[PDB]
Amino acid sequence: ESSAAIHATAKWSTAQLKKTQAEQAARAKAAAEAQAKAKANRDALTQRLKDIVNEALRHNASRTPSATELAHANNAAMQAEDERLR
Amino acid sequence: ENLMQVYQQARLSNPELRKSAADRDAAFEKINEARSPLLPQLGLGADYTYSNGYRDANGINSNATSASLQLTQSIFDMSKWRALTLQEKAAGIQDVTYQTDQQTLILNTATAYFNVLNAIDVLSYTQAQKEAIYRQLDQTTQRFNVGLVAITDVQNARAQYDTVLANEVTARNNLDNAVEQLRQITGNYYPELAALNVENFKTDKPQPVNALLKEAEKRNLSLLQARLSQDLAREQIRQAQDGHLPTLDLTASTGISDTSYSGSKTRGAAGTQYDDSNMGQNKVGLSFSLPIYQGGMVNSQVKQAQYNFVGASEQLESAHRSVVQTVRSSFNNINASISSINAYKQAVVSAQSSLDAMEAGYSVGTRTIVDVLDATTTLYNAKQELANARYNYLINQLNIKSALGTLNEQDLLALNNALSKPVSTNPE
Amino acid sequence: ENLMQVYQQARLSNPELRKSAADRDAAFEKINEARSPLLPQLGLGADYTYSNGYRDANGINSNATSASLQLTQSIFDMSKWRALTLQEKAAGIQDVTYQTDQQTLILNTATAYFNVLNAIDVLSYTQAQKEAIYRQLDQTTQRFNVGLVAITDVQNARAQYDTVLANEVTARNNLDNAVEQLRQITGNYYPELAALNVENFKTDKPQPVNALLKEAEKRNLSLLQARLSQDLAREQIRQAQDGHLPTLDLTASTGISDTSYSGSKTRGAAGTQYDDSNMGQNKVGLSFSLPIYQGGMVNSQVKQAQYNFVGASEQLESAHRSVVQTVRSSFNNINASISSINAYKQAVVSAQSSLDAMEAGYSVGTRTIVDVLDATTTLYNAKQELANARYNYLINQLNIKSALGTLNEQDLLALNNALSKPVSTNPE
Amino acid sequence: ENLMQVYQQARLSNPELRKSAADRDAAFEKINEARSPLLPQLGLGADYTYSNGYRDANGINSNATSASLQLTQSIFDMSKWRALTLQEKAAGIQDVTYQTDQQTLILNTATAYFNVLNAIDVLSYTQAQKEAIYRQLDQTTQRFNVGLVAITDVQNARAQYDTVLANEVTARNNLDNAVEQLRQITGNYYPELAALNVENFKTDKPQPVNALLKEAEKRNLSLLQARLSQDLAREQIRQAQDGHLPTLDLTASTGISDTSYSGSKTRGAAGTQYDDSNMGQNKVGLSFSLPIYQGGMVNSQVKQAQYNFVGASEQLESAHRSVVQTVRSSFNNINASISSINAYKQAVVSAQSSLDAMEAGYSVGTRTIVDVLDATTTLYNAKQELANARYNYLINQLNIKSALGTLNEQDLLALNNALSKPVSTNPE
């Protein structure tokens, strides 16, 4: 009976479509998750390279006195030389 | 709009790209902050002081004030030069970050555009399937009322029609969500998009995967960023090691100072010595420093920097394995989408050649018209699979170019030439 | 318990929210640390020193010791006022973060509660489907033993029963795991939950999307946090710009010292220069500072702060687009859940009408057992879709209140009013 | 290779674990940096200056120089002992982080290996289903050439066969992409893997969930890391509180200097104030400091540390709920995979018994080829789910060992005992 081939093909075809839709949804979800992880990793790297240099500049800014601290030390040293002659 | 026109509106307005451009420009501006400690520093400092002596110093009060300009510049300080070269490398890593955020906007714009077209097609096939099932349901209902057909075929046709109505609501909601994803990327809503030219559409074969691997190893942005990150980790070994070096600074100043005295011990003849005093000084000085030993600190910092560089060199192997897998899986997916388009094209043509014979002979009287209803499902299943396979080929054809790192506006132009007639994003 | 009682336990119990409350309280207490540099700074120093002169000063020895109570108070330094007002803004940003964690605990508690109820219903329909298929396996086995049907009908019913048995094991595992997600949120196991009153349940149409958007854009916590983050980035420009300004501090001190001398050059008539001393000193003084030039450092810091504010203004556009898409998708998903509930409500009745006709069709021999098993499985599938659609409507009915930023326990009370009969989380 | 041999190549080469090992060893070398400020600091300073007086200091000029080797040693500074102790605790937290990466490489290697074996079986069953569907296309073509059936039956057989070809393409693509993911973990392509010995495969019942959970509570690495993180936050309270304590440093210096004077005012009877000098100073001293009031700063820091410890103690409760849910869900999924293996093993024999009846019925000609097709497609669906369930059981047997925190290579040896004959990763 020809109808039995039509019924079998209709039912089996619809199962292959539903399988393909489930695969397509899983494929889209996995790609979106991988992109979100990669974006978060680039943001973390962006903060790391910023903090590496900010810490190196903070260290260089504290390896020595500042121009203000040296001006205040000189202001004291003028008075210390006056008090040597006093 | 077509895909190219949609991409121009995205490129001009998209905040993900425009934030990344601002975060890049800030890193290039920080090169001047990192340069600045090598240049002449200049400041004014000034003071006033009252003082009152007691306990042996009793009966001496004093009033003093002074000011000076102070110049400073490093003559030799490699730790400052390393802070500059690290910022030049950090800005380079940030530019490759911006190139990656720029390149991914292209892929996301095309993905959103083809998701809207795919949702329009899935809705259109669901509506075409519904109307075909409804025509068969109606004809079965007439044949039942004439007494030619048993009510069980009308009940089955109602179950088919009622479940396809729930599928149309689902397909409609998928389209009405997809256009808002396109709005979020592009900043705009579109009443109609240029559809895929399926009447002329054809698939090209990719390059052999050995050529794709050799190309990606030259130009992939994630691998390039990993190479630059390894070099920044290597420069941090030198920035640690240079902590052992001597340091030399030039300083220069012009200062002025005044002082007076008061109180009982400064009165009378003692006021000859505790007289008012005035001073100015110009001076120049070279200050030198050399750390001889620091509890082993710099030797630990060098070993930490060496382990950080080992970590960065393994992170480059991680990046290399990742791009190798990405071009190979993209090459597989292009060959799979090409061969499955060819399979589903023949499945649609044979299902159409079936349905064109079924809808004649089984309407005329060969067997129940529920066989035309079942034959209809095979065709609209196959048309949905074929349409979805075409959009998978188009998306993978951009995806492989993102894996090469070459993906740019000329690839959107190449895909935009595969579009033609406009279709509305909002059916009646 | 009902949904309200589950939430009133979760609100008190949940560590994720209580951790967020601790981070909020820490960010507010840190305002006082940010205030401290504007208040008096006060400490005691003390010293002791031996000294031995060698070359020229050869054989002048001395010993000195001192103590000094010291005070400092800043009179003008805008960087400390910026640091305070930036911490007050950072605390405000942490409070809207805590409000978002408080609001998302409600949505997670409701989502877990409805996932358990949905799993109880999926298991219940799977057991009912298994028993209906078992009744047909028994009836066809009897008909086969009487000789009314071939053994192939029993083989079809048996294979269909054995595959639905494997689905019941799967449905039971989905329920058993869903209850552990509810335990992870609430801290508690529950033997029974109040089920949805499907006899009295009815859907309500949402407000028009323009009114939802107009309310969300003035209440959504993610958008509010982005506005506060842009305002913080604007204050960071002022923090950079104020780096050009002068600075003025007040200082005060009360010192005491002792000093004594020894060695060959301090004996005899020369000893009158040395002797000993006991000086006390009060001091009060102002110290002024003005950076004149710093290699362009502050100009780079200002331009970096401006690019950071541009990045924050694009972060606000990103938040605004995200709210628009979240409100529009939630409004569409509500309308889709309402219309699909009314589709499946009909599809269950026509599937049941089809099954009643199909078992009659098999009894008169115009259908096969496989048609009855398909009519059975399509009916129990339509029941599972209808039940699932009600829970998706209830979750989306909270999701739009989350998109509006208004979601609170009064919405849980409104949903809890639709619950009635207790059903066990752990059936026999 | 078998799974044990694959894991040797993974453990030797894998960049994720090797990068984690470098990040662990860096944190242990940082203990030597954290200890270094407690040890003697030693530095050579040197100086040269020219000076030129003006305004009553007019006609006084000077050249001066110094060299000074100087030493510092803390006698009491509790903040340094706290900073060392915090780095030893941070290194301990990093060691259990590395131990978690070492453990998760095992689970990832086994998961990737079983994904390849599962894809080989899915492809093999898809090719068996293709071989069965081809018999319909053959029979309809022969019967059409005999003139016994219409062209419609060939067109539907072609539409079905061209669709199972699209499924073979999909299965083959999934096998290729599984092998690329295994090659990312392991660094290697394998032509052959050792397959599961399904003829001697044996399900085994887990320990009771109370015994599993009582072991996991002593042993789980994420819970141990949360306990160590709470203890670090508790040490940070002591590190904040000890900011109220006094400080005491020793220092020493072997200083040398030279000085001379020039200009008109340096000459004549006042020249005793302006004579040449060569003085050295060999000195040793103690320096004490005690903050008395700091605008409440240390009390804000102590309360911030107390809120941080409250936050860390709620992270420990969150970790405890996470391992409870992970152990219970692993125990559920072992019992469910064991039960569903038994269910699908019966379903395969049941569907095989149905197919053996249809195949005999088709061979004598009382049944149709589409009866055999329906029996074969349902059988290979059952065989595919039985294979899928076996690999899920084997993965869940590692997942409970991961939840216990005991997972190590002896669990891969226990799996490797169930592996046997080599199968090609890339068939004909």
Side-chain angles (χ1 to χ4, degrees):
Chain A
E1 180 65 304
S2 57
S3 311
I6 277 71
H7 304 316
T9 306
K11 293 175 187 184
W12 178 96
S13 173
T14 303
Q16 309 329 293
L17 175 67
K18 289 174 65 177
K19 192 200 306 176
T20 301
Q21 290 174 338
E23 164 55 22
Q24 177 62 86
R27 187 183 299 181
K29 185 178 178 69
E33 182 171 44
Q35 181 169 264
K37 288 173 63 177
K39 189 184 184 185
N41 186 272
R42 292 195 305 277
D43 290 346
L45 174 60
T46 293
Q47 186 59 29
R48 195 184 184 218
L49 63 88
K50 189 196 302 171
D51 285 334
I52 283 164
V53 173
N54 285 349
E55 181 58 17
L57 294 173
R58 192 191 72 82
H59 188 194
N60 281 294
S62 56
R63 274 170 48 68
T64 67
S66 71
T68 284
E69 182 168 20
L70 290 169
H72 293 173
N74 181 58
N75 290 355
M78 288 188 289
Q79 294 169 83
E81 178 62 10
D82 186 14
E83 289 297 327
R84 191 184 68 87
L85 299 177
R86 198 58 46 231
Chain B
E1 273 80 323
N2 67 23
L3 172 63
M4 179 54 60
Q5 292 162 346
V6 170
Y7 175 68
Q8 299 311 322
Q9 295 178 26
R11 185 183 62 75
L12 290 167
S13 76
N14 180 278
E16 313 294 334
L17 185 158
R18 289 168 58 121
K19 183 179 180 294
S20 188
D23 290 338
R24 192 286 306 272
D25 294 351
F28 276 68
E29 188 58 64
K30 183 174 288 288
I31 301 169
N32 297 318
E33 176 178 31
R35 196 198 317 284
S36 72
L38 298 170
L39 304 181
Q41 312 301 295
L42 178 62
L44 170 63
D47 299 90
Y48 168 84
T49 291
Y50 178 79
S51 181
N52 155 249
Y54 67 99
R55 188 187 185 257
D56 184 30
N58 192 21
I60 304 179
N61 302 321
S62 184
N63 176 101
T65 181
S66 57
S68 62
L69 298 175
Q70 179 71 68
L71 189 74
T72 293
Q73 189 176 22
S74 301
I75 303 301
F76 183 87
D77 189 2
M78 294 304 299
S79 180
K80 289 179 172 185
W81 289 102
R82 293 289 177 219
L84 177 59
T85 58
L86 288 173
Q87 186 52 38
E88 290 183 334
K89 290 180 189 296
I93 291 161
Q94 192 61 210
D95 195 76
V96 181
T97 305
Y98 175 60
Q99 292 179 41
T100 303
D101 292 342
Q102 180 177 22
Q103 181 161 86
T104 52
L105 179 63
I106 287 168
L107 187 65
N108 282 270
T109 299
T111 297
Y113 187 98
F114 292 124
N115 269 263
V116 175
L117 292 185
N118 192 19
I120 293 167
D121 289 343
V122 167
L123 177 61
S124 299
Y125 298 136
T126 301
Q127 287 185 339
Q129 176 175 353
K130 191 188 69 175
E131 292 302 315
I133 289 167
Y134 181 75
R135 284 170 60 243
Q136 268 40 245
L137 164 64
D138 181 22
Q139 185 60 210
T140 301
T141 300
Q142 304 315 321
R143 291 178 187 208
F144 160 66
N145 277 272
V146 179
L148 305 177
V149 169
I151 196 170
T152 175
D153 284 2
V154 179
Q155 297 298 339
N156 276 273
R158 281 306 308 247
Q160 292 290 350
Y161 182 69
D162 293 348
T163 55
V164 171
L165 280 165
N167 281 265
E168 199 209 334
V169 169
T170 303
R172 182 68 216 212
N173 189 52
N174 290 345
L175 175 58
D176 289 328
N177 275 267
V179 296
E180 312 306 345
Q181 316 315 298
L182 185 64
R183 192 202 302 264
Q184 179 164 357
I185 297 297
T186 66
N188 199 11
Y189 171 71
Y190 304 99
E192 66 196 336
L193 300 180
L196 182 63
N197 193 26
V198 298
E199 300 172 44
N200 306 154
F201 173 89
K202 62 182 180 179
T203 56
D204 295 336
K205 189 181 179 180
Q207 296 81 3
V209 77
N210 306 86
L212 300 177
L213 286 157
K214 287 183 294 185
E215 178 64 11
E217 286 176 3
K218 295 293 184 180
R219 269 173 284 278
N220 179 287
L221 299 181
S222 183
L223 187 69
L224 173 62
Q225 178 157 85
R227 289 174 177 146
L228 294 168
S229 299
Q230 181 186 245
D231 197 52
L232 186 80
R234 185 163 54 200
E235 188 67 2
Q236 285 166 89
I237 298 171
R238 289 185 284 257
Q239 188 267 351
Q241 285 181 333
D242 292 347
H244 288 148
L245 295 177
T247 302
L248 180 68
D249 303 300
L250 176 65
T251 64
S253 178
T254 292
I256 191 168
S257 180
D258 302 312
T259 292
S260 186
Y261 306 95
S262 188
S264 60
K265 188 171 290 290
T266 73
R267 305 304 79 211
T272 309
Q273 192 67 15
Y274 295 100
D275 197 7
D276 298 344
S277 185
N278 307 102
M279 174 183 295
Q281 294 190 342
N282 304 306
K283 64 186 65 170
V284 181
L286 287 164
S287 183
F288 175 96
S289 183
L290 172 63
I292 304 297
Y293 177 79
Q294 294 187 315
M297 182 183 291
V298 179
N299 299 65
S300 175
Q301 290 176 350
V302 169
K303 288 177 180 180
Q304 290 175 59
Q306 287 172 347
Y307 283 118
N308 176 64
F309 170 77
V310 170
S313 77
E314 300 295 8
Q315 187 166 334
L316 177 61
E317 170 66 13
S318 176
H320 189 190
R321 292 187 182 198
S322 183
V323 303
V324 168
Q325 180 267 98
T326 302
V327 299
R328 281 172 150 275
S329 61
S330 298
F331 173 87
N332 297 337
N333 290 349
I334 291 183
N335 285 278
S337 58
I338 291 167
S339 56
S340 63
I341 285 164
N342 279 270
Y344 290 130
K345 184 177 179 180
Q346 298 296 346
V348 168
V349 169
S350 57
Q352 186 77 67
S353 300
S354 170
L355 186 64
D356 293 355
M358 293 297 300
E359 185 171 32
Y362 296 67
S363 182
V364 167
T366 297
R367 223 69 169 100
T368 181
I369 214 171
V370 179
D371 297 358
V372 189
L373 199 171
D374 282 348
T376 290
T377 72
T378 73
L379 182 61
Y380 290 106
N381 294 343
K383 286 185 179 184
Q384 284 170 91
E385 290 180 274
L386 179 58
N388 194 74
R390 289 176 174 143
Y391 297 120
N392 273 259
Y393 171 81
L394 290 161
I395 291 168
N396 281 279
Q397 181 61 95
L398 299 182
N399 198 85
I400 205 158
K401 291 179 170 183
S402 88
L404 299 184
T406 60
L407 174 63
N408 73 83
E409 185 182 71
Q410 301 297 341
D411 304 302
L412 294 181
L413 184 61
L415 271 71
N416 195 73
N417 277 269
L419 310 178
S420 63
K421 62 195 178 186
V423 295
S424 182
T425 66
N426 178 28
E428 76 298 332
Chain C
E1 272 80 326
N2 68 22
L3 171 62
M4 177 55 61
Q5 291 162 346
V6 170
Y7 176 71
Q8 294 298 345
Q9 293 173 17
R11 183 181 60 74
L12 180 63
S13 176
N14 180 273
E16 311 158 76
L17 180 59
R18 290 167 60 124
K19 187 281 191 182
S20 188
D23 289 347
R24 194 287 306 275
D25 295 351
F28 274 68
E29 187 59 68
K30 193 169 197 69
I31 301 167
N32 295 318
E33 174 177 35
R35 201 196 314 283
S36 304
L38 298 171
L39 298 176
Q41 297 290 318
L42 208 175
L44 172 63
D47 305 274
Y48 175 97
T49 290
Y50 176 85
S51 186
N52 159 236
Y54 83 105
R55 201 180 75 162
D56 184 18
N58 203 91
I60 302 169
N61 303 326
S62 70
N63 177 216
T65 180
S66 63
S68 58
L69 185 66
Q70 182 173 5
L71 178 147
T72 297
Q73 170 61 64
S74 191
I75 302 300
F76 180 84
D77 183 359
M78 290 304 301
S79 72
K80 291 171 172 57
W81 292 103
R82 296 291 178 215
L84 174 60
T85 54
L86 286 168
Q87 186 57 38
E88 291 184 323
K89 290 180 188 295
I93 288 164
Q94 193 64 35
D95 194 76
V96 298
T97 301
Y98 174 68
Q99 293 178 41
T100 302
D101 291 339
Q102 187 174 17
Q103 183 159 86
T104 53
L105 178 63
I106 289 167
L107 188 64
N108 277 273
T109 299
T111 296
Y113 186 97
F114 292 125
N115 269 265
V116 175
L117 291 183
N118 195 18
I120 292 170
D121 288 345
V122 166
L123 176 62
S124 183
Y125 295 129
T126 300
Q127 288 185 338
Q129 181 183 245
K130 192 189 71 175
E131 186 165 35
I133 291 164
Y134 183 74
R135 182 182 60 73
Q136 282 293 353
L137 173 60
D138 184 11
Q139 181 169 357
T140 55
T141 297
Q142 293 176 39
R143 289 172 63 79
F144 165 67
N145 277 273
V146 179
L148 304 177
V149 301
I151 197 170
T152 53
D153 289 15
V154 183
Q155 296 295 349
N156 274 275
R158 183 68 210 211
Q160 183 62 98
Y161 176 77
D162 287 317
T163 51
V164 170
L165 182 284
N167 281 266
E168 199 219 324
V169 173
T170 303
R172 183 67 212 230
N173 184 52
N174 276 265
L175 174 59
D176 288 346
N177 291 304
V179 178
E180 310 311 339
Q181 315 315 299
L182 184 65
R183 192 204 301 263
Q184 189 183 265
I185 291 159
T186 65
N188 292 339
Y189 174 75
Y190 301 94
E192 64 189 19
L193 302 181
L196 180 62
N197 193 321
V198 298
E199 303 303 330
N200 293 273
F201 171 85
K202 60 183 179 181
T203 50
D204 297 335
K205 190 180 179 180
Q207 293 182 354
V209 76
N210 303 82
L212 294 171
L213 288 164
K214 184 56 58 187
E215 193 72 4
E217 76 182 5
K218 67 176 66 178
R219 291 194 187 279
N220 179 284
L221 298 181
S222 182
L223 184 64
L224 175 61
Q225 181 162 7
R227 288 179 176 132
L228 293 166
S229 299
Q230 182 186 245
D231 193 54
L232 184 79
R234 183 163 54 207
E235 192 65 20
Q236 289 174 339
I237 297 169
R238 302 182 181 127
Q239 187 192 23
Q241 284 180 332
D242 292 348
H244 299 93
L245 296 178
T247 287
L248 180 67
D249 301 321
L250 176 66
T251 65
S253 180
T254 294
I256 295 179
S257 67
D258 299 316
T259 293
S260 184
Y261 290 94
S262 188
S264 182
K265 288 196 177 193
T266 74
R267 283 69 170 92
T272 63
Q273 173 57 19
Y274 302 105
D275 195 9
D276 60 12
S277 183
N278 299 109
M279 301 202 297
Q281 294 287 272
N282 293 309
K283 295 176 65 177
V284 180
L286 289 164
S287 297
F288 177 90
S289 166
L290 174 60
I292 289 165
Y293 179 70
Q294 300 186 267
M297 182 184 291
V298 190
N299 309 81
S300 180
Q301 289 181 347
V302 168
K303 288 177 180 181
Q304 290 174 54
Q306 288 171 346
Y307 291 127
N308 165 71
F309 169 77
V310 172
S313 78
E314 302 298 5
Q315 182 61 83
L316 176 61
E317 173 64 13
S318 304
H320 186 77
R321 290 187 184 198
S322 299
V323 173
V324 171
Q325 187 272 123
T326 298
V327 171
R328 286 182 172 277
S329 59
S330 297
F331 172 84
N332 279 279
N333 291 344
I334 290 167
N335 284 276
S337 71
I338 294 172
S339 55
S340 64
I341 284 164
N342 287 285
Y344 293 123
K345 183 189 294 173
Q346 295 169 82
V348 167
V349 175
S350 60
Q352 183 171 358
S353 301
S354 298
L355 176 60
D356 292 347
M358 201 76 83
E359 287 189 321
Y362 182 69
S363 184
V364 308
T366 197
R367 300 297 187 204
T368 184
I369 189 64
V370 186
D371 307 325
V372 176
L373 296 168
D374 288 347
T376 299
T377 54
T378 54
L379 172 60
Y380 281 104
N381 193 165
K383 288 186 175 186
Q384 287 166 85
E385 299 311 331
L386 179 57
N388 182 60
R390 295 187 182 114
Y391 297 119
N392 279 266
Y393 164 86
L394 291 166
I395 291 165
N396 279 277
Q397 183 68 2
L398 297 181
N399 203 82
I400 188 64
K401 303 302 189 83
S402 185
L404 288 162
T406 57
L407 174 63
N408 71 86
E409 74 288 345
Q410 194 70 5
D411 302 288
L412 295 184
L413 183 63
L415 271 72
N416 192 76
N417 191 53
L419 310 178
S420 306
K421 294 182 180 181
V423 298
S424 183
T425 64
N426 181 19
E428 76 297 333
Chain D
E1 274 80 323
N2 66 29
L3 174 58
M4 181 56 61
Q5 291 162 348
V6 171
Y7 179 66
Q8 308 317 296
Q9 298 177 21
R11 190 182 70 257
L12 179 64
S13 75
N14 181 277
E16 315 306 328
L17 181 58
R18 291 169 62 113
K19 191 272 187 184
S20 186
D23 285 352
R24 195 285 305 277
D25 295 349
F28 277 68
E29 281 301 344
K30 196 169 198 68
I31 303 167
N32 300 315
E33 175 175 35
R35 190 170 67 259
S36 72
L38 295 168
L39 303 179
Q41 312 302 298
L42 181 73
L44 174 61
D47 186 18
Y48 168 81
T49 180
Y50 174 62
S51 181
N52 160 247
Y54 72 95
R55 193 186 71 115
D56 193 19
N58 189 25
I60 303 171
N61 314 272
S62 181
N63 301 75
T65 182
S66 178
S68 184
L69 180 65
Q70 62 178 353
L71 176 147
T72 301
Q73 170 62 63
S74 297
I75 304 302
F76 183 88
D77 185 358
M78 190 58 62
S79 73
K80 292 181 173 185
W81 292 103
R82 294 290 179 218
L84 173 58
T85 302
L86 289 172
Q87 186 56 38
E88 290 185 336
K89 290 182 186 295
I93 289 163
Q94 192 78 329
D95 197 43
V96 300
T97 301
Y98 169 73
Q99 193 172 7
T100 302
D101 292 341
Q102 188 177 17
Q103 182 158 89
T104 52
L105 178 63
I106 294 168
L107 187 65
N108 278 274
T109 300
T111 297
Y113 186 98
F114 293 128
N115 268 262
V116 178
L117 291 185
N118 182 65
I120 293 169
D121 291 338
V122 169
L123 177 63
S124 300
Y125 299 147
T126 299
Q127 288 187 329
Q129 182 172 171
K130 173 188 175 186
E131 273 293 327
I133 290 173
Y134 184 67
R135 312 310 166 103
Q136 177 192 218
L137 178 57
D138 186 25
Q139 283 293 309
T140 56
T141 298
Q142 302 316 326
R143 293 170 189 254
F144 173 74
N145 277 271
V146 171
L148 182 62
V149 304
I151 187 62
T152 50
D153 302 11
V154 181
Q155 294 288 3
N156 288 288
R158 282 190 171 280
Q160 192 164 29
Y161 185 65
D162 293 340
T163 302
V164 80
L165 264 63
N167 281 259
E168 184 184 22
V169 167
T170 300
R172 191 63 176 247
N173 191 56
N174 275 270
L175 175 58
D176 293 340
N177 291 345
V179 173
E180 294 301 346
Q181 287 168 96
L182 179 64
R183 178 265 180 274
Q184 181 174 2
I185 299 298
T186 65
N188 286 273
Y189 293 104
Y190 302 105
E192 300 181 328
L193 301 181
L196 184 64
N197 203 250
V198 297
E199 60 263 56
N200 299 294
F201 170 89
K202 187 180 296 182
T203 49
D204 190 16
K205 187 178 177 288
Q207 288 182 343
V209 75
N210 304 87
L212 291 170
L213 184 57
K214 284 177 178 181
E215 186 61 23
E217 181 169 284
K218 297 179 296 176
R219 193 76 69 187
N220 180 287
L221 300 179
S222 77
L223 184 66
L224 173 60
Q225 181 160 2
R227 289 177 177 131
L228 293 168
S229 300
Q230 180 185 248
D231 194 56
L232 182 77
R234 185 162 54 206
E235 189 64 14
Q236 289 177 346
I237 295 168
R238 290 186 283 254
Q239 189 257 269
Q241 285 180 332
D242 293 347
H244 281 293
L245 297 177
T247 297
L248 180 69
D249 299 310
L250 177 148
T251 184
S253 311
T254 300
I256 298 175
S257 72
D258 295 83
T259 295
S260 186
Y261 297 88
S262 187
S264 59
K265 191 166 183 170
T266 77
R267 302 183 182 181
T272 58
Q273 298 292 358
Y274 313 111
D275 199 6
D276 299 340
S277 179
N278 315 97
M279 64 184 290
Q281 293 290 277
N282 169 35
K283 65 170 64 178
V284 181
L286 300 179
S287 188
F288 174 94
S289 181
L290 173 59
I292 286 164
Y293 177 84
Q294 296 210 251
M297 182 180 292
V298 183
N299 295 341
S300 179
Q301 290 177 348
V302 168
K303 288 187 74 196
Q304 288 174 61
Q306 287 174 347
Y307 292 126
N308 199 151
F309 171 77
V310 172
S313 77
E314 301 296 10
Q315 289 178 214
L316 178 61
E317 175 65 12
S318 184
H320 187 270
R321 292 183 191 200
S322 299
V323 303
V324 170
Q325 185 275 129
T326 300
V327 169
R328 286 182 171 277
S329 62
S330 298
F331 175 86
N332 292 338
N333 283 280
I334 291 172
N335 285 278
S337 61
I338 293 171
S339 299
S340 61
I341 284 164
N342 282 273
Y344 286 120
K345 188 176 180 181
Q346 290 292 349
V348 166
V349 174
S350 186
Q352 182 72 67
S353 301
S354 182
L355 178 60
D356 294 348
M358 296 300 183
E359 175 63 17
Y362 165 75
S363 298
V364 74
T366 54
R367 299 313 312 191
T368 69
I369 188 58
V370 301
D371 302 316
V372 171
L373 191 155
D374 190 28
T376 301
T377 55
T378 53
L379 174 62
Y380 280 105
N381 183 59
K383 288 187 176 187
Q384 179 174 336
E385 289 285 31
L386 180 58
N388 180 35
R390 287 173 173 146
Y391 297 122
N392 274 267
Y393 163 81
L394 294 168
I395 291 165
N396 277 277
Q397 284 285 16
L398 301 187
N399 207 88
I400 189 64
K401 295 283 179 58
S402 188
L404 289 163
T406 58
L407 174 63
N408 70 81
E409 80 297 330
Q410 304 303 311
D411 304 293
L412 298 188
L413 183 60
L415 291 175
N416 206 73
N417 274 264
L419 305 180
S420 63
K421 295 177 65 177
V423 294
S424 178
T425 61
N426 185 33
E428 67 184 321

